[PDB]
Amino acid sequence: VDPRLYFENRSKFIQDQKDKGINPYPHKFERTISIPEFIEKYKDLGNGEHLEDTILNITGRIMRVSAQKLRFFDLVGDGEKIQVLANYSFHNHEKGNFAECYDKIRRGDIVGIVGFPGKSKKGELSIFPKETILLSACLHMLPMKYGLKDTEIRYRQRYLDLLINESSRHTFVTRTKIINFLRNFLNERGFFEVETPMMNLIAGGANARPFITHHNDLDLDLYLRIATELPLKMLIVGGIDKVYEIGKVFRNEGIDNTHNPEFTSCEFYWAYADYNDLIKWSEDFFSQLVYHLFGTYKISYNKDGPENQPIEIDFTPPYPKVSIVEEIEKVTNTILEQPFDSNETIEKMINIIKEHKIELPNPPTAAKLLDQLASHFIENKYNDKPFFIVEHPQIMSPLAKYHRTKPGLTERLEMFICGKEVLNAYTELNDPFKQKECFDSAFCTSLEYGLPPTGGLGLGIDRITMFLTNKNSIKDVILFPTMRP
Template identity: 45%
Template sequence: MKTGEQDTSVEVKLRGRIIFIRSAGERLRFYVIQNGEEQIQIVSQAKEGDDMEPYLRQHEHLGRGDIIGIVGHPGRTAPRGRPVGELSIFASQIILLAPSLWMIPKDTGFTDAEQRHRNRALDLIANRSTRDIFRARHQINFFITNFLSSRGYISVETPILNQIAGGASAKPFMTYHNDLKRDLFLRIAPELPLKQLVVGGLDRVFEIGRVFRNEDIDLTHSPEFTTCEFYQADANYQDMMTLTEGMVFGLVKTVTGSHITSYTTQTGETHQVDWTTPWKRIEMIPALEEATGVRFPDSQQLHTDETRDFLLGLLEKHKIICSVPQTNARMLDKLVGEFIESTCINPTYIIHHPVILSPLSKAHPTYPGLTERAEAFVCKREICNLFTELNDPFEQRERFMEQARQKDQGDDEAQGVVDEGFMRALELGLPPTGGCGIGLDRLLMFLTNNYSIKEVLAFPMMRDEVKRGKEKVVGGDAAGVAGAACADELEAKQQKLMEMRAEMEKLEKEIAGLAIK
């Protein structure tokens, strides 16, 4: 189509949000509208001799952020001083579908992280980078579902409300069921119900869903987050490591187009992460011995008081703080974080965890006191946890009882109650099984180069925001942004909307007979 040409034989109907407005005299208006990631210019021109009042009244009420419908035909403008006009829609009718009562920011004008997290809708309107994050989340979920389904896994759903919080070491949220008259817990992991399905003969199962943990909120932790857990009969931790790294490698290439991604930490340190398989393996206890220069107690004695004294001395020597309760498991975990996790930039498995750190993992047949378990770390952060599942009901009960003892010592994250429902299922016989849990939010953080988990959650949990004077505003209601400073202004805009609606009813009748180019 040449400059200045219009094709009146083709009728086009569009909907979009106005992101730019300009005029060239009374009779000519230009709008740029956006729908998804596509933008196009709309040209509206009043004919010579037409009554200008309805035309002017209609366009007077249109502003940036409004959603409009357009009926028109394609063409190219004929700008002065430029050889090629812009492809545009020449409108014969413009209808206000939904006004925006809030002024939207221009281009990258909405950058304050706190306000973006509180007002995600406006953030999505203003920032393509935010929209890209949630499209990447969809790609991750879609890829994992297809990957596992193509290998014989079936997608299942397990309860979010449970009588017992099990399947992981974490502090749960608690609620109360009025009809049943008992406390219930939001799940901290779907592991135990999923393994019961394997007991029942569903040999390969997976679930993508939310879990909830009543713990600290920081850059990498949220009280609710998304995991994918999958379990496979006739598999062990070695099989699950191979399956997991292969799945994540394919996922990374699909989402980013490369096997190498860039990640910048909150301190400004940038890492080039190579996701190529196979991932590196590090044995936990030998690595700790090499890093600290001392020999650790026998792995079968890591639960003893003598080991506790040894770990306390090691923490003191290296000036590492471990909050109370200083159980052997918590102190050992602190040392792993300080000396091993901190070295893992490219995807790395830390393997063969002690039994005291792994209440649901099968004991290693070659290394007494250790388990067939692995955790994967990227840029010093955990992304998945996997192991050969413990299927001995007698040993599992002993492990649960040890967790209860740790709970009595003050460890709120320990699993303090024996899940008898799970134990009954285990007593029916769990075949040799491998399982894995992946934190999808943290994986998304790495693939979109965001160091804050709030950036990858559509609606992150926010602390209360205190505004002017004594007024305290909570949650999403605290998002006063870009041109809408207070409740009085919002009320005035709502009044204007009512007036606009009445005006539009009159305009619709007048516009029906008005020809607009």
């Protein structure tokens, strides 16, 4: 029938069943066992064995109906499935009519079943109901997995995605397992989880336009946080020497497969740690995280989509370290001299952009030219293993401490997976007089009270989940991505 017509039939059926005095949405059904526990407890029953002495109460959603006095159903719950075989021989006719009970049941209805466990004569693990009650009706027609495959409905109606395609549930189980592992990884090393405000009075910094909202009680316009960097460092001043936060941060810019205006970040700050501690932490976390999920350090990833051949990513540490300026000079055969914002070096960088591959010129400030020469010459050198780009010029990282030996550089590291930034870390500049941005006000004042030598690090949780669940879009690892209505 037409999907519009099917909905009106079940709607009239609900009120038609309310007119007969029946409540089609009962309040409570006291379940005794779950479908996963039911599978594990009765997996090894005989072919055709019936345990008609053990009576159980089970719930689930009906996802299949089959055909007299014999009826068959598929009962799905917690991502697993069993069969329902309603036999007229085992039905309790004192509690109601067999036909009238099972005729009204359709696919998608949530039911509670009182019956016994057993396997079919063909060897299908089933529950044999003596009684079946409708707990919640399904008004619409549920589509087949073909019906959800290549459409945007997976994002607009995520609940049908989780019901119909088993791989979707696995993606988000993996996401939670990743975040659980990270939180436990930090707590095992003495890190302390905190909450910092999501709205502040200082707009975004140098990267993206902010989300602007009005605080009614203060009559002020505030800005959603672009990062947890500043308040976490103030806690380091406060004596919380190992601190971190896992939460949402916002950048009011354009959406694409690896950028979402609202995304999940983890930042930690580690007093008395330096650039080398942050490198070893990254190599330890990612290698142990991949082994925790897969039992191996090698994963497969369809970088260019499931249509195309996948690449193998090896997370066996150690990972290569590539110095940005020295490697750009190696691959471009040039030498870029003292301050990179010089008119001579900016001319040389722009003369590399257009002389070499015609790739896209930009608004030409020195940090942007360097950032795009790195994206064209470095960020795709290694696609079979993660690697760090290190020792970024201080003109690209104002809050990163100056390099100990190389002038004009910092002790910064950025880890890449398949050309995409996944981690950002550096030792934090703690000399208030060398922080030109103070010569944001609450943070500069806190620096004057003494920030110890500190190493900070930032993780992209959504992108990490993308690579570990073999996804090409960030929308595939977010439960409810914001979509155009």
